[PDB]
Amino acid sequence: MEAKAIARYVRISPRKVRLVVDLIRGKSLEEARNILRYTNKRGAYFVAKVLESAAANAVNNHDMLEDRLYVKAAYVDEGPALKRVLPRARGRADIIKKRTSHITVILGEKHGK
Amino acid sequence: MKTYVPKQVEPRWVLIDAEGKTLGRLATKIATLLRGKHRPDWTPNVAMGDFVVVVNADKIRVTGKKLEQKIYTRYSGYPGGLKKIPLEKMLATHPERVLEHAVKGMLPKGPLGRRLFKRLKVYAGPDHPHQAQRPEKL
Amino acid sequence: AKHPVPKKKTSKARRDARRSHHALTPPTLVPCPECKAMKPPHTVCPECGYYAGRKVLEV
Amino acid sequence: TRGEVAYSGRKIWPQKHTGRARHGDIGAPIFVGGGVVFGPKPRDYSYTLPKKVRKKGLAMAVADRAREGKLLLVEAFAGVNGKTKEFLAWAKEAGLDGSESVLLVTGNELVRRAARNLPWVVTLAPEGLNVYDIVRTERLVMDLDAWEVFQNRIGG
Amino acid sequence: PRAKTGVVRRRKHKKILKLAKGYWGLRSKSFRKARETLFAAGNYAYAHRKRRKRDFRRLWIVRINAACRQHGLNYSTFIHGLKKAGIEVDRKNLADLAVREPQVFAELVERAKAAQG
RNA sequence: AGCGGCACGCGAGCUGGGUUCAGAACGUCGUGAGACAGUUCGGUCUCUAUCCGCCACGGGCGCAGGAGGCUUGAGGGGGGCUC
RNA sequence: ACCGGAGCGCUGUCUCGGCGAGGGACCCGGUGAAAUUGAACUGGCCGUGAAGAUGCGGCCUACCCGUGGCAGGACGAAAAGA
RNA sequence: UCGGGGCUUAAGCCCAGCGCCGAAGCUGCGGGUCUGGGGGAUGACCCCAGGCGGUAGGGGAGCGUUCCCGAUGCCGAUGAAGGCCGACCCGCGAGGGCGGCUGGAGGUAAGGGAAGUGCGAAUGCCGGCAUGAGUAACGAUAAAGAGGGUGAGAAUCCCUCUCGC
RNA sequence: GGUGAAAAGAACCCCGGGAGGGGAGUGAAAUAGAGCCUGAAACCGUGGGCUUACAAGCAGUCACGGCCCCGCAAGGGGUUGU
C-alpha cells in the first residue's frame, strides 16, 4: 500500500521546500528522520512534520509498520500566494508576492515478498 | 521501389605511397575515398569510405616555387597572433601536417568529415603499424 | 531600473541550469558512542556524549 | 455608445513622457466598460410595402391552399355554443383528426373560444387575415362570411 | 443580437496547437509563435518536395557512376551510351539496381560501351 | 621626442574645462518681442550586467581496466630597448 | 560664500603610490523586488547585404553549467528627438 | 585568404570537337481548377483545345458564430452544452462527424430571417502568470554579552551581573 | 454572483503546537468540502518513454537510420544520430 500525506496552504515559497524534499526524495524512513532533523533549513521542520504525519497515517489506519516503510513520492506544489504591496523610493507602486507550498510525502511497502 | 541501404559493411583498409606525387592531385583521390564515393556502396550519412594510411610523405613533390613560397597561416586568438610558417619549414619539422591539413580541406565539414579525417593515417617513412590488409594501390 | 537591463527572456532551460548548480546538498552523520543516536561528526550529541560526560539534560 | 457612459471626460494620463500608453478618458471602446462603436439602438426594421403586392399575397396564399383544397366554408356550425366538446365532435364530422392546423377562419367568437385553447389548432379570423398565418397552418374554416370578406380585399 | 466571441478562437487555436506540438521554443506552447513556425515549416516542406526529388536523382547518379567506374570507364560516357545506344529507358535509380545484381548492370555497361564504338 | 586609424579609440569606464537649454550682461542688429559659424559670468552626466565578450576559480562527464606519484611539449603567452 | 593673475606657508592634488581601520561587497540561516523581455540551441575573423551581423557566404576556433570579477558590443535599457 | 583547398606539358589563358550534370523551364503519368467547344432535348456528365506567380485593389463562391421563424414539433437520464484527447472518414479550405474521457441540464435538423458577426500584434483595454533571481535590498557604524525564565519552538518576549549612545 | 434536491455543511479517532491532512461517516456525486458548478490557456512541478558532454545554431523541413509502444501481416506513433 501507499500512505498519502500532505499539508496544503502552508507558508514557504516552492523552490525552497522543493529542494528540501528532493534532499530526501525517496529513501529509508530512519534516514529521512535524521536528514530532516539535521539539515539547516526551515522547510526542514515543515517537511519533517508532514512526513511524521505520513508515518502516522500508515501506522494507525492502514497497517504496514515503519520497518517496511519508504518514501514513495514527495512533491510540494504551490498554492496561490498573498500579494503584499511594498513601497519603493520615488513612490513606486511595487508588489512583493508571498508564495505558498503543498508538501506531499507518500510512502509504503519495502519488499512485497 | 525504394533505394537500397547498405548495412554495416566492412571498413576496407588501403595503402598508398606518397613520393613522386603532386601535393594537389594526391589527396584528391585519397580524400574522395574517405567518402565511399569510389565504392558502388556510397551513402551520404553513414561513413563507410575506407581507411587511408599513407607512407613516406616526407618526400612529397609539388610544382610552383611553392616549396618556399607556399605559406600556411595559424591564428591564435590573442591579437597580433597570426603565425605563418612556409611549406619550406613544414617539411623540415613535422612534414605529415602538410598532407593532413590538405585532405582536411578536401572533404565536407559536417562532424563526420572530421571523424573521417581521423579515418586516415599519415606517416613520413614509409612504415606504419601493419594492422591488416592495406593492399597497395596507385 | 537602470543601465543594466536583461535584453530577452531567459529560457526555462537556462533557469534550470543556473539551478543545475544549486542542489540542496545532503549533510552527513555518525552514530553516538555507547547509545543509539545520530550526532554530527566530532560533536557532542545532546543526550549522549563523548568520553567525559557533560550536559545530558533532555526531558 | 461611448457617449452616455456615466464615466468621465478627463484625460487620465498626461500624454507624453508617461512611460505608459496614450489615451484620455475611460469612455472609449478600447477600454474596459467603455462604450461600443456602432452597436445596438432602437430601430424600426419594418417598412411600407404596396397593398397590391401584398394583396396578391393574401389571394395567392389562399390560392395555394385552394390549389390543394383544405378550406371549408360551413354556413354555421354544429358546435354552436362554447364548448371544446362539441367542436371536437364536429371535428370528427369534418375529419380534422389531431395532426392538422387552423388558420381557422370564420366570424363568431364562440367558435374561436372553443378552438382557442386547442394546440394543433391555432385559430385565425378574417379582419386581419395574414399570409404568414395561413402558411404556418392549414384550415380556412369559415362560413361564406370570410369568403365574401376575402373577395372585397382583392377584387379589381 | 449579441455575437459572443465564443469558443471559435480557442477551438481553432487548439487546432494549431495540435499541429505545432513537438516543436521547441515557447513556440512549442505559444499559440502565436507556434503558428509562425508552422508557416515556415509548410513552406520548407513544399520547397523540399521539389528538393527531395533533386536530392534523390543526385544520389542515384552518384551511385550509378561509382559502379560504372569500378567496371570500365566513367559515367558520362556510359550514359551517352544508353542515350545513343538503344535502351531508350533505364530509370536512373533503376540503374542503381546496379548496386544489387551487378550482372545485368555490367551487361548494360558493355552494351553502352560497344554501342558508340 | 614619428605620423595615422580604430563611431575625429575609449562617458552602461572617469572628467564635464569646450559645446548650443531656461538667468544676466557688454558690443551688436532690430521702433520692437528678440537676435547674432560675436563675447563675458552661472549651470542635476541615472547605484543592481541578462547574452556575447574579456580577466581568474571551479563543478559534470570524459580519456573504451582500477588507484598514487613523476611527466613529453602538440599548441601558446611573455620577452625583446637604449645611452 | 560672485569672475581673472600673482606670491607666502602647508599638504597623498602629483611624482606614485605602499599599508591600516571600519561599513559593503564574499560564504551560511530567514525574508526577498524592480525596469527590460519577439523567440533563442546567442563565438571570432574576412567578406557581404537598406551602407555598423552570433543568424547570410567563406574560413577558423569551440568538451556541458557556473562563481567572483571587468564593461568592447548586443546600433545596450530610460526619454513615440528638446 | 582566389568562394576556401589546391592547380604550373594546369584546376591558369587562347582555339576547336565530342560528351554529362543541371531549375519548380519543356515533355510523360494521376488529381483540382477556370474559360471556350462538343455529344448531351439530358441541368447532371465524361471528352476536347487554351489558361491558373502575384501586394494594393476590383470580383464570385462558402465555412463558423448570436438570436429569431421553422417550435404546443424535435433530441437529451441509456446524459443536453463547454472542455480532455484522437493514428479513422468527409470537403482543396475556413470547417465537419465519429470514437473514447470529463461533466451535468440543456440543445434545435433539413429549409429561411437577422446582426455588437471570426484578432496576434494598436509602447491597445482588464485579468492572471513567468523574467531577471534565490540576485538587489532587509530604514542611519550607538553595539552588543552571558546566566535564568516561559513555552512545541526563542539572537528577536521577561528577570538581575555586564557593555555601549 | 452558482456547494447541494436537501445543511444532511463532516460527531469519533489519528499525526499535529495550531494550520492542514489521513480512516470513518453525509449524499446520486465530497471529481459538490465550503469564495466549493462546469475549470479551459499560460503557469510551476512528480514519475515514465526517446536523445544529449569535439561542438557554430530563426530552431524547422526531406530522407536514411536507431530506440520505445499499438498492429495478424504489411503498415502506424512518439523520440533523435547523421
Burial class of residue E111, CB neighbours in 10 A (0-12, 13-18, 19+): middle
Write out the three cell numbers for B95.
612534414
CA distance C57 to C51: 17
Write the DSSP symbol of residue A40: S
The answer to whether B18 and B30 have CB atoms below 8 angstroms apart is: no
By C-alpha distance, which of D140, D130, D83 is closest to D107? D140
Q: Which of E56, E60, E99 has its CB closest to that of B40? A: E99
What is the rounded distance in angstroms from the CA atom of residue D10 to the CA atom of residue D3?
Answer: 13
Half-sphere exposure of B35 (CA within 13 A, CB side): 20
- Hey, what's the cell of E38? 508552422
Residues of E with CB under 8 A from a CB of B: 56, 59-60, 62-63, 66-67, 69-70, 93-94, 96, 98-100, 102
Task: Give yes or no for CB of C7 within 7 Å of strand G.
Answer: yes
Cell representation of residue D40: 445596438
Whether B104 sits with its Cβ under 7 A from any strand G atom: the answer reads yes
Q: CB-based contact (8 Å) between C30 and chain A?
A: no
- Strand order, beta sheet including B51-54: B13-16, B51-54, B120-121
| E18 C-beta less than 7 Å away from strand H | yes
**Chain A span 50-109 residues with beta carbon within 7 Å of strand I:** 52-53, 56-57, 60-62, 73-78
Resolution as reported, in Å:
3.5
Which alpha helices (DSSP H) does B5-126 contain, by range?
23-34, 66-69, 87-92, 97-103, 111-118
Residue A35 to residue D150: CA distance in whole angstroms = 101
Give the span between the Cα atoms of E27 and E20, in whole angstroms: 8
| Residue D146 CB-density burial (10 A; 0-12 exposed, 13-18 middle, 19+ buried) | buried
Q: Is the CB of A16 under 7 A from strand I?
A: no
- How far is B101 from B98, CA to CA, in rounded Å? 6
Instruction: Compute the 3-state secondary structure of chain D and give helix, strand, coil in percent, each to the nearest 5.
Output: 30, 0, 70
SS3 label, residue B50: coil
Portion 92-131 of B in contact with E at CB < 8 A: none
A with B: 3 or more CB pairs under 8 Å? Answer: no
d(C-alpha C5, C-alpha C7), whole Å: 6
Report how this structure was experimentally obtained: X-ray
Q: Quick check: bond before B126 cis, omega within 30? A: yes
E36 CB contact with strand H at below 7 Å: yes
Chain breaks in chain C (C to N over 2.5 A) after: none
Calculate the alpha carbon distances from E79 to B3, C23, D47 in Å.
20, 67, 83
Give A72's contacts (C-beta < 8 A, 6+ positions apart). A2, A26, A106, A107, A108
Give which of A13, A34, A47 to mutate to test C binding, by max C Cβ within 10 Å.
Answer: A34
Q: List chains touching B (3+ CB pairs under 8 A).
A: E
User: Sheet of A78-85: strands edge to edge?
Assistant: A7-11, A95-103, A78-85
B18 secondary structure, DSSP code = B
| Top CATH class, A2-110 | alpha beta
The amino acid sitting at B115 is: R
